[PDB]
């Protein structure tokens with residue numbers, strides 16, 4: 001995440017870190033004791049899920065690890081256009097909850113008017129390096145008209161744009177699958193966007209979570 005800053009230690013209990021080959025690959029969102037929601041492009045064999053993490057370089061009393069017993073990628077995910085970039089990860093066992101490990105409710109209403117949101121992750125920062133401490137940044141949802149104007153012919157109904165015209169705060173490589181939180185509900189998942197990262201002109205594009213309430217519900221059931 002570029003142009004942001006370190007998150008408060010107790011503000012991201014729903015944040016999951018996804019690892020493979022010993023390195024962080026993506027972020028994810030705990031939406032149920034047995035399920036972590038993330039981006040479909042975070043699919044890799046032998047994913048490791050870490051909950052209750054804040055600083056990657058410090059062993060934290062609240063961190064819990066888990067293996068993935070099953071990964072459900074959206075049947076219509078398209079890795080070229082990024083359409084339907086969503087995947088559900090079933091944990092070996094239900095997550096143990098506490099102040100630092102909690103699920104995040106999904107935004108079911110696509111017309112929700114809460115525009116001031118925030119993103120977070122351990123992805124690449126402005127200096128081009130990967131932080132040990134998770135980063136946070138507040139951004140705003142951008143109208144679909146402006147979204148489509150920035151990315152003509154590349155935005156589908158399954159995508160939502162968000163960015164920061166002042167500092168260009170934006171998600172980046174490594175933040176993929178992480179949450180776009182609006183009004184205490186999950187509004188989107190880090191999917192793709194401008195490269196180099198920065199959202200002043202080209203806003204970040206997120207998976208439109210409100211569109212998948214039925215699919216997720218049916219999958220967890």
Ligand SMILES: [Mg+2]
Pocket residue numbers: 076077078
């Ligand atoms: Mg298709």
